[PDB]
């Protein structure tokens, strides 16, 4: 059983993702949109986080959060190491990819697809409006372009 502390997990760990950009600098550009987009999932979870009283209505839906929780957990964890100047340097210099948190994002949206489905079916709960899939890469790639000049700018010559 236990209290409704588990629910707060998504609330804290959810926003914690964006909190990183607050301390970051090089990834502050990407993390900016990363957290803003990731917060859209926990946003509608804060309004229900309070209503949560009894134990659990259906473990079926709760199971979606169990995995989802880790989905974003990796985001905040990846941003930490990303802070390394060499990490981003070798990444950009490598010229292999354009995004930085595309992996964690792709899964974050994939897990939410079904998850939100269980939360909406179990009870009136507003889920992310975005398509949750390709739309992510669409904006991530378009915005990632800024990283080009944004990065070069950070390193004054
Ligand atoms: C998944 O992590 C917690 C959680 C958080 C949020 C929801 C939720 C539900 C509806 C709409 C939106 C969100 C559900 C579950 C959680 N897992 C549990 C497992 C067992 C019990 C139990 O009492 O046996 C309670 C649990 N509490």
UniProtKB/Swiss-Prot annotation:
Disulfide bonds: none annotated. It is found in: Cytoplasm; Cell membrane; Nucleus. Residues 58-87 form a coiled coil. It comes from the Eukaryota. Changing residue 79 to G: Does not affect formation of homotrimers, while translocation to the plasma membrane on necroptosis induction is impaired. The modification Phosphoserine is found at residue 128. The record marks 89 as: Target of necrosulfonamide inhibitor. Residues 5-152 are annotated as: N-terminal bundle and brace (NBB). Signal peptide: none annotated. Phosphorylation by RIPK3 induces a conformational switch that is required for necroptosis. It also induces homotrimerization and localization to the plasma membrane. Changing residue 89 to S: Abolishes binding to necrosulfonamide inhibitor. Pseudokinase that plays a key role in TNF-induced necroptosis, a programmed cell death process. Does not have protein kinase activity. Activated following phosphorylation by RIPK3, leading to homotrimerization, localization to the plasma membrane and execution of programmed necrosis characterized by calcium influx and plasma membrane damage. Belongs to the protein kinase superfamily. Upon phosphorylation by RIPK3, undergoes an active conformation. The coiled coil region 2 is responsible for homotrimerization. Interaction with RIPK3 is species specific: human MLKL only interacts with human RIPK3 and not mouse RIPK3. Homooligomer. Homotrimer; forms homotrimers on necroptosis induction. Upon TNF-induced necrosis, forms in complex with PGAM5, RIPK1 and RIPK3. Within this complex, may play a role in the proper targeting of RIPK1-RIPK3 to its downstream effector PGAM5. Interacts with RIPK3; the interaction is direct and promotes its phosphorylation and subsequent activation. This is Mixed lineage kinase domain-like protein. It comes from Homo sapiens. The gene is MLKL. The chain holds residues 2 to 154 of 471 of the full protein.
């Amino acid at each position: 059983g236990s209290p409704g502390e588990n629910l707060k997990h998504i609330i804290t760990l959810g926003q914690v993702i964006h909190k990183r950009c607050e301390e970051m600098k090089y990834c502050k550009k990407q993390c900016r949109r990363l957290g803003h987009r990731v917060l859209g999932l926990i946003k509608p979870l804060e309004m229900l986080q309070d209503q949560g009283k009894r134990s659990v209505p259906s473990e079926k839906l709760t199971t979606a959060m169990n995995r989802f929780k880790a989905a974003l957990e990796e985001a905040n964890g990846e941003i930490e190491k990303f802070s390394n100047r060499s990490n981003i340097c070798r990444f950009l210099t490598a010229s292999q990819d354009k995004i930085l948190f595309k992996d964690v994002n792709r899964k974050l949206s994939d897990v939410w697809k079904e998850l939100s489905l269980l939360l909406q079916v179990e009870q009136r709960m507003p889920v992310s409006p975005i398509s949750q899939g390709a739309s992510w890469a669409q904006e991530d790639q378009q915005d990632a372009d800024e990283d080009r000049r944004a990065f070069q700018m950070l390193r004054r010559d």
